Ligand code: HEM
Ligand code: HEM
Ligand SMILES: C[C@H](O)[C@H](O)[C@H]1CNc2nc(N)[nH]c(=O)c2N1
Ligand SMILES: C[C@H](O)[C@H](O)[C@H]1CNc2nc(N)[nH]c(=O)c2N1
């Protein structure tokens with residue numbers, strides 16, 4: 093047929109026809125491929141595939157530690173095989189889940205902080221059963237993770253998937269996120285990215301405080317239930333007010349950002365089974381906030397105002413005012429986080445560390461799935477070592493898959 | 506167990522327990538939306554044994570009308586309908602029958618003062634309609650006709666009757682033209698606060714929130730049984746009157762206006778057993794509706810505060826009767842403004858006097874006249890009006906214009 097291609101700035105969509113007349117087509121540049129998503133269900137994962145997946149995992153698990161528990165290996169193997177063939181699905185040992193989350197992170201080809209893969213905290217919420225109960229696990233998480241600026245990587249694993257109609261899901265893109273409202277005067281306030289998701293919350297009776305930085309409410313769904321709106325306790329949301337170390341007028345911009353980068357809506361797959369709810373977090377890398385969040389035309393879009401107050405030639409592309417501005421916004425972010433004693437890493441050190449990660453990774457297990465397109469910082473790419481490193485992107489297991497935005501695939505009352 | 510009482514001002518709800526200790530002698534009279542005045546949903550057609558006598562009764566009403574009855578046709582029609590009823594289930598009215606139906610249903614509406622005009626009505630037959638887009642057109646034809654560039658004309662457009670009860674035509678709007686109400690960011694409320702919930706609805710169905718004080722809401726229509734199709738009204742069709750006082754030049758500074766067309770949308774016409782859940786109709790405004798209710802209710806535009814202020818009255822002293830003074834001026838503003846721009850309207854006094862004449866004609870004629878004193882007495886200057894001093898009985902006849910459960914409460918989502 094054809095291939096759908098989207099421009100994340102315009103939202104403009106294109107359909108490729110020409111690719112057919114191809115030679116005797118890397119999807120690479122595509123953002124949400126079906127090859128990285130793990131969709132809904134109605135029937136539990138059929139045995140023939142669930143079984144070999146599970147066994148693979150357990151052989152991986154028992155393969156890790158020095159001096160293998162040879163007997164326990166077969167014992168666990170046998171036990172699991174029977175455990176599966178009998179009830180259908182199967183439960184992981186706590187220790188196993190730990191290993192899974194760390195390995196799944198180790199296998200996230202679009203993450204640069206993977207050198208930190210072994211340093212993770214797991215919150216076993218597998219026995220959770222209600223939204224009010226989820227909310228509490230989430231708060232425990234945010235709080236643990238925030239740690240008063242000294243950010244700590246953690247993940248909270250909710251009950252696995254059973255049949256398909258009994259899914260635990262966080263509807264948010266990430267734990268903390270600012271609201272975005274299309275205003276009457278034709279304009280747009282706050283984070284333009286979370287526009288649809290914000291309207292959604294408004295529909296579910298959320299109180300729109302109409303601001304640039306209004307933390308979005310938590311939308312959660314347990315077992316198979318309809319989503320429950322939970323306003324996040326403000327004392328839990330640590331923020332950093334943006335201010336330049338030389339441009340005192342920068343503070344006048346009234347900028348700030350949340351210290352916690354916790355991905356919400358992703359799915360953890362392991363040994364065949366999948367957990368559709370498992371928010372996790374690490375810490376920020378300057379460019380994320382400075383370049384992406386602040387400068388994207390699709391997001392906060394500040395660049396022009398920053399180049400303007402900087403005295404640069406805003407009307408001449410060739411002047412490179414954008415390169416000048418953005419760099420200043422980056423130092424602002426790094427500076428502000430640095431000052432208010434909140435963890436963050438610059439793209440340079442981040443890259444240098446990822447490079448050392450790879451060396452350890454190849455020397456260790458033989459490879460390292462990497463998505464060049466993603467791993468190369470959004471600014472000063474070639475100044476970065478990763479830009480000069482060839483790399484292969486490939487899905488392994490366990491893994492963190494994306495998933496169909498819940499509000500689309502859902503049975504209401 | 507107990508009775509629910511609502512205060513339409515604060516919107517507060519109360520539960521009456523005491524009424525049980527009542528006597529061996531409980532007027533609901535004060536209640537706005539009783540069940541006795543409503544006619545809800547369905548799942549099955551009208552059981553024949555009922556449908557039949559109602560139909561015959563109706564046909565007997567009709568033919569019993571004309572001077573020198575068409576006895577043969579009377580019998581024939583009875584016979585034909587009886588037949589049609591047993592053959593189809595439901596039955597269809599001769600156009601002239603509908604005409605008579607709508608005029609009587611109006612004539613039987615106890616809460617209307619304009620009823621002396623009961624015989625001067627225009628009926629638009631949209632019974633053969635089948636799509637929302639098609640409704641929309643009939644509606645525009647209606648609005649256009651009614652408006653008549655100021656010389657307002659009373660009319661009603663009758664859509665398809667009820668079949669089973671899951672195949673109903675319904676206008677979700679209170680009335681044809683109606684300003685929107687938005688609960689704004691700064692905690693305030695712009696526009697008509699009465700149309701707040703309904704606005705959000707239009708918003709949810711992807712309506713473009715124009716965020717103003719006078720934004721004419723979109724027609725939310727539903728055909729056969731299919732979901733509501735949102736249709737915005739053509740601004741050229743919506744005639745309005747900008748409010749301005751004949752002496753207080755500062756009154757126009759208030760930026761006030763109001764639509765010229767009072768067309769009730771969501772009511773139901775019952776006749777000879779059948780029922781049309783969609784049949785918008787209109788008369789013309791009566792000053793006090795806009796001047797007192799629309800402009801002065803706490804739950805509506807609520808202007809009284811500043812109309813008094815700008816008039817210079819002692820706004821913080823109830824006993825100064827400033828509210829009495831202010832309102833009266835708002836009323837003349839409205840009457841003046843309508844009169845000025847050649848848009849039909851009637852002051853409450855002349856209206857009441859004419860209604861008194863209506864009764865005299867009505868009793869002498871048929872023997873009664875259903876009246877809801879609570880509704881018929883103007884919201885201001887009650888006793889100055891003849892109707893205040895008039896005792897009246899409030900009873901439901903047939904045909905009739907019943908209220909009906911707000912459709913968004915009882916609807917299917919495919
Ligand atoms: C230790 C701190 C960490 C740093 C500095 C780091 C940094 C990054 C960066 C820069 C991105 C790009 C985000 C974007 O462009 O939207 C990213 C993506 C990602 N990270 Fe890491 N990360 C860290 C920890 C983690 C942890 C703890 C996990 C898993 C438990 C993880 C899982 C992922 C995944 C799955 C993505 C892909 C997100 C997506 O596809 O939208 N990261 N990370
Ligand atoms: C000729 C001009 C007419 C005038 C001056 C008039 C006036 C009024 C007034 C003052 C009310 C009270 C409205 C309110 O307080 O909400 C009312 C209610 C009503 N009118 Fe008349 N009307 C007229 C024509 C009509 C027509 C043409 C019909 C029907 C074909 C009609 C049917 C009704 C009904 C059923 C109500 C009750 C509304 C409700 O219960 O909410 N009116 N009218
Ligand atoms: C279209 C293109 O794939 C897309 O804009 C990319 C590129 N690389 C990225 N890299 C990271 N880390 N994060 C991103 O959002 C993106 N987006
Ligand atoms: C509670 C009370 O019945 C209610 O406020 C009434 C009284 N009479 C009325 N009379 C008219 N014409 N219109 C009304 O809305 C009302 N409201």
Ligand SMILES: NC(=[NH2+])NCCC[C@H](N)C(=O)O
Nearest residue numbers: 353374375376377380381385
């Ligand atoms: N460092 C991370 N783990 N980031 C993941 C999500 C953060 C996201 N890029 C943001 O700017 O909000």
Ligand SMILES: NC(=[NH2+])NCCC[C@H](N)C(=O)O
Nearest residue numbers: 767788789790791794795799
């Ligand atoms: N004259 C009428 N038919 N009025 C019926 C509805 C008008 C309504 N009372 C209003 O002020 O908008």
